[PDB]
Amino acid sequence: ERQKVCLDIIYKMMPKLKPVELRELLNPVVEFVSHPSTTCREQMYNILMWIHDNYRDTDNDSQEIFKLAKDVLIQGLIDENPGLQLIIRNFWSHETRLPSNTLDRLLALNSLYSPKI
Amino acid sequence: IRIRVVQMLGSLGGQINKNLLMMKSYVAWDREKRLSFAVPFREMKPVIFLDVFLPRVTELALTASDRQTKVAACELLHSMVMFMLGKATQMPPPMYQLYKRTFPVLLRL
Amino acid sequence: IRIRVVQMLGSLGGQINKNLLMMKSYVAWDREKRLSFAVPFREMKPVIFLDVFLPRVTELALTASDRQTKVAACELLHSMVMFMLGKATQMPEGGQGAPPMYQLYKRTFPVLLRL
């Protein structure tokens, strides 16, 4: 319950937040990965999708934030929940994050990688 | 099951276990990659010779744990043989060696 | 030339001119519809029955002024007969000697020889 309410607070407040504060805000957020609650991880991924869209465009704190968000997204790209896996795939497979051109799609997805996935 | 199986295997001693594995029996069954297939897209149609999957896709479809895996493999095998026998309509020994390879597998399955 | 032709036609009078024209001009060559072709697009593949153009194009290809027009017609007919001949293969043909195209042979072949 506290997890969910905290994450909802975060999701509501992020648009006003400055990137510099957002950095050390997210640093203790990232641990809800592997947490055994689909609600927690899904709110996580909502936050991360927002960050990715709002930071794929500077501020080195923001740059590292974006890198970390993409990394944890890749982390999520393996789940115990097939539904989470599907929805995050749809997010990633979407054109803005996977170029419509198959050549460009492949070229972009080449970057997306972790030595854990 | 698999844990006990590997346990038994090591229990035997490798001098028996190496019997798990001459002409070496891999010659790239058909000299020609006669399984051409251009995958659909919106910009291009890269061609795939599904030949390479043949042995693999058979053996997994022949024997495998994880009933899900085996069912998926054999369904895809059904689809691919369906296609190739559709592809038999072609220029006039088309998949003669391929038939030799596949028919015993098909009948056992 | 055309001017003098129509001049002649009017000179001859109607009682003569009507000799220009019972099988009654058509039989709708194939009892079926075939010779299909799906035109390619990035979104859809509309299918087109090429056969419908055969009676017209042949008359154009066999008979035409405008060397440019006639050449275009004959080249296009060559392409279509090539395509149809290729389509002859890969056909289930257990009802006739050439079910998917038998009458088209009858129509084309004299025209092919004339051309």
Swiss-Prot record, chain C:
PTM summary: Autophosphorylated at two clusters, the T2609 cluster and the S2056 cluster. Autophosphorylation induces a conformational change that leads to remodeling of the DNA-PK complex, requisite for efficient end processing and DNA repair. S-nitrosylated by GAPDH.
Domain of life: Eukaryota
Coiled coil start-end: none
Residues modified to Phosphoserine: S36
Subcellular location: Nucleus; Nucleus, Nucleolus; Cytoplasm, Cytosol
Role, per record: Serine/threonine-protein kinase that acts as a molecular sensor for DNA damage. Involved in DNA non-homologous end joining (NHEJ) required for double-strand break (DSB) repair and V(D)J recombination. Must be bound to DNA to express its catalytic properties. Promotes processing of hairpin DNA structures in V(D)J recombination by activation of the hairpin endonuclease artemis (DCLRE1C). Recruited by XRCC5 and XRCC6 to DNA ends and is required to (1) protect and align broken ends of DNA, thereby preventing their degradation, (2) and sequester the DSB for repair by NHEJ.
Disease: Immunodeficiency 26 with or without neurologic abnormalities: A form of severe combined immunodeficiency characterized by reduced or absent T and B cells, recurrent candidiasis, and lower respiratory tract infections. Some patients show dysmorphic features, severe growth failure, microcephaly, seizures, and impaired neurological functions.
Family: Belongs to the PI3/PI4-kinase family.
Subunit structure: DNA-PK is a heterotrimer of PRKDC and the Ku dimer (composed of XRCC6/Ku70 and XRCC5/Ku86). Formation of this complex may be promoted by interaction with ILF3. Component of the core long-range non-homologous end joining (NHEJ) complex (also named DNA-PK complex) composed of PRKDC, LIG4, XRCC4, XRCC6/Ku70, XRCC5/Ku86 and NHEJ1/XLF. Additional component of the NHEJ complex includes PAXX. Following autophosphorylation, PRKDC dissociates from DNA. Interacts with DNA-PKcs-interacting protein (KIP) with the region upstream the kinase domain.
UniProt-recorded name of the protein: DNA-dependent protein kinase catalytic subunit
Organism: Homo sapiens (Human)
